[PDB]
Design a protein around this ligand. Structure first.
Ligand SMILES: [Cl-]
Ligand SMILES: [Cl-]
Lengths: 211, 96, 111, 99, 81, 98, 83, 94
């Protein structure tokens, strides 16, 4: 399935709904997309992401105190969302089902020509029954991308989403690897930051042609 | 009674505080880290000396230690250590 | 001389001693000439490996709810990492034991 | 009225208990006597530091635990769950120590 | 001075095998294991006593056993180095 | 119909024939192509002395023959005469290269 | 030209000859792919070390001495080409 | 051309001293030269390590003797210690 690309003369800002994230990745990566944000709405049960947001992100983000607070009225009041992303820093099933329920509120109806994009993230240590159930719920197959091209750790990941070009395009770079090596905490940034910045900008690369 | 056996104990503790500021370390684990540093040291200086004898050279520079690290550390650990080492030699050669 | 005695560790932005590494490269009978980039680079490499292992060991101490790194924590830190296992496969760490590894066929058929 | 477990459950329980612990499983004094007995056939009146015998014990127990690991892999490979001297000999043969 | 190999007891070999992950131990294991342990200790103590001979000493230090095990490709941490 | 042997007899005959011989069993040119292919992923435009590729072939065949010796011991140990990737993996695991 | 698919050049009869020198009587079918994998990983390690020795020698031709030093470093000392 | 040194004529001399009629090929000569270089490097390595362990800087016959007793297994060690002590006596009393 291929979606039509609007030309770049129509520069509308991107409305993002990021649901679960320890260190807020999506707004920062959208700041380094080169494009502006329409609406960025975040929420977290704990107060750690709220503290990180009220210290770092300068208050350009609409926060909700709890994920159990967002209803259909809040989605219809805070504008339609263009992107919906769910990740994480036995509650993983809880995170997925809250994600899918909020995803059903943000999906456009039959007739809207608005470009919609979503993404869900979890590693390959999931039970295979939960994997096939999530494949049934999302109507999309995950891709098993391993940390073996850029890394050596046995931490592979399944991806779900509506992203154009996500099957086998990811490979190993040498220049990005070289620039990312220079740290004494190189593999701690490999365990966290390499899952945060480069893979996400690699997957959300073609959105700048849309907007 | 005056004999001081040298060690890397204070330096392992300083790097630990610079990584985990609230986590301490026992003296047995300090001995294991000391012998790990001594071991890896001997391995890299060994390989460097061997390389220097191979290439008909008598001067061990950073390039000999660099290719000894690229030999001894397995892959991405070698890439991170060659980057960290070249960064520290850059900082060293252009300091006050 | 009239100058601030800035050590080569701080000059290189490192922690491990460039002087002790340098005089062990001299005394250790490895070559006739030993440079300065060699002990600077080697102190950097040793500091990075010590940093990574003490990092993983503090992690395993945190997982064990302890603030003091024991031999067992170094054991888990090295043997649960793949590249540190490749580095120290032929190396015994005392008071460490082995990983909690139980094969699948030895478990009872809880189905 | 007296309770009794199956063999596999106490066996696996001991496997877990000793893979969690770190203490030396061979007793200190009979290992020391074995070390002095073996040393006797190389030089008479040999002395030992305590840390030397502790180092011998750490390395000997670690060596035998890696040996039993490989021996268990030989047993499992031969569709068994019981280790045999066949398995020890296969392990030492593949490791190159048969000399 | 001959039952010192019998000091490596059947419970102790069983504990070692439990740490190695062994579920079931046949009876012919224990004598074989005493033999293999004795051969390993022969090689190690032979090398360590050789190192003691070269230092013209009468006691075997832990550094000697470390050097011996290091020579035999089984590096031991935590005893100097 | 013409004469036809049992499997074991020609198998043992080849075991005897190749344990007596000393020549390289892998052909020279596909091994050379394999060496250039593996080298390609480390540096472009690498050159090789002939004795270097011969040294690689001597060591590679010796390594694989020691591997099949340990693999045959794993097979025989499992009450089988057929080597399996089970046996190869057991051999490499006990040797410590996994 | 980028060389590809050269691991198939280690043919099935060559693996059978290597098996015969090792004393193997009977050979299953997955042996050949597994053996190509193991030989590939072995040559990866050895050629990686030899290329590294070439890199530090400021050269571009891998000598036999480099491969000897590499095999020797990995605890498999090869006689016949120096050392 | 720079002369690449070898132990080839010395291997031929000791071969004639042990088999006066049997020759040797050049590839087997390379294998013997590589064995001699290898065992040389092994013994001089272990002996250097022995000198470093005992805080010494002089390699004497005792360091090489203990290195040979480490590296050669058993009877090879005993016969090499015998032959070597013999040759060191023959050297110091000539
Ligand atoms: Cl330099
Ligand atoms: Cl048996």
């Amino acid at each position: 399935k291929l979606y039509p690309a609007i030309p770049a003369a129509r520069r509308r800002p991107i409305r993002v709904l990021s649901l679960f994230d320890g260190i807020a990745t999506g707004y920062l990566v959208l700041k380094e997309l080169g494009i502006k944000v329409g609406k960025y709405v975040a929420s977290e049960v704990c107060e750690e992401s709220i503290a990180v947001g009220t210290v770092k992100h300068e208050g350009n983000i609409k926060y909700v105190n709890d994920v159990r607070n967002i209803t259909k009225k809040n989605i219809e009041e805070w504008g339609p969302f263009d992107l919906v992303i769910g990740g994480s820093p036995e509650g993983t099933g809880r995170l997925f089902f809250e994600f899918y329920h909020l995803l059903n509120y943000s999906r456009p109806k039959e007739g809207d020509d608005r470009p919609f994009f979503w993404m869900f993230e979890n590693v390959v240590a999931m039970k295979v029954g939960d994997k096939r159930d999530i494949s049934r719920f999302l109507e999309c197959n995950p891709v098993m991308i391993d940390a073996i091209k850029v890394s050596a750790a046995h931490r592979a990941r399944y991806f779900w989403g509506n992203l154009p070009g996500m099957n086998r395009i990811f490979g190993f770079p040498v220049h990005y690897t070289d620039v990312s090596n220079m740290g004494r905490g190189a593999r701690q940034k490999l365990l966290g930051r390499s899952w945060s910045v480069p893979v996400i900008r690699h997957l959300f690369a073609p959105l700048k042609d849309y907007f | 009674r005056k004999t001081r056996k040298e060690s890397y104990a204070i330096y392992v503790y300083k790097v630990l505080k610079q990584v985990h500021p609230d986590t301490g370390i026992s003296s047995k684990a300090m001995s294991i880290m000391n012998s790990f540093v001594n071991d890896v040291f001997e391995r890299i200086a060994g390989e460097a000396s061997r390389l220097a004898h191979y290439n008909k050279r008598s001067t061990i520079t950073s390039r000999e230690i660099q290719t000894a690290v690229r030999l001894l550390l397995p892959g991405e650990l070698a890439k991170h250590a060659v980057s960290e080492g070249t960064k520290a030699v850059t900082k060293y050669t252009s300091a006050k | 001389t009239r100058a601030k005695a800035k050590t080569r560790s701080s000059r290189a932005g490192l922690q491990f001693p460039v002087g002790r590494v340098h005089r062990l490269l001299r005394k250790g009978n490895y070559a006739e000439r030993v440079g300065a980039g060699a002990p600077v680079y080697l102190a950097a490499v040793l500091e990075y490996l010590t940093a990574e292992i003490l990092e993983l060991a503090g992690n395993a101490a945190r997982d064990n709810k302890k603030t003091r790194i024991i031999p067992r924590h170094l054991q888990l830190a090295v043997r649960n990492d793949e590249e540190l296992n490749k580095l120290l496969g032929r190396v015994t760490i005392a008071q460490g034991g082995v990983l909690p590894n139980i094969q699948s066929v030895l478990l009872p058929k809880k189905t | 009225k007296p309770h009794r477990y199956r063999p596999g459950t106490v066996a696996l329980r001991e496997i877990r208990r000793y893979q969690k612990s770190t203490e030396l499983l061979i007793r200190k004094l009979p290992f020391q006597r074995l070390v002095r007995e073996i040393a006797q056939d190389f030089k008479t009146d040999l002395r030992f530091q305590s840390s030397a015998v502790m180092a011998l014990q750490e390395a000997s127990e670690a060596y035998l635990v890696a040996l039993f690991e490989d021996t268990n892999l030989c047993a499992i490979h031969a569709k068994r769950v019981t280790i045999m001297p066949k398995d020890i000999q296969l392990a030492r043969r593949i490791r190159g120590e048969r000399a | 001075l001959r039952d010192n190999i019998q000091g490596i007891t059947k419970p102790a070999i069983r504990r070692l095998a439990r740490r190695g992950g062994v579920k079931r131990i046949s009876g012919l294991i224990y004598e074989e294991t005493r033999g293999v342990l004795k051969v390993f200790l022969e090689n190690v103590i032979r090398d360590a006593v050789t190192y003691t001979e070269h230092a013209k000493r009468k006691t075997v230090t832990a550094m000697d056993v470390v050097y011996a095990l290091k020579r035999q490709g089984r590096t031991l941490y935590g005893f100097g180095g």
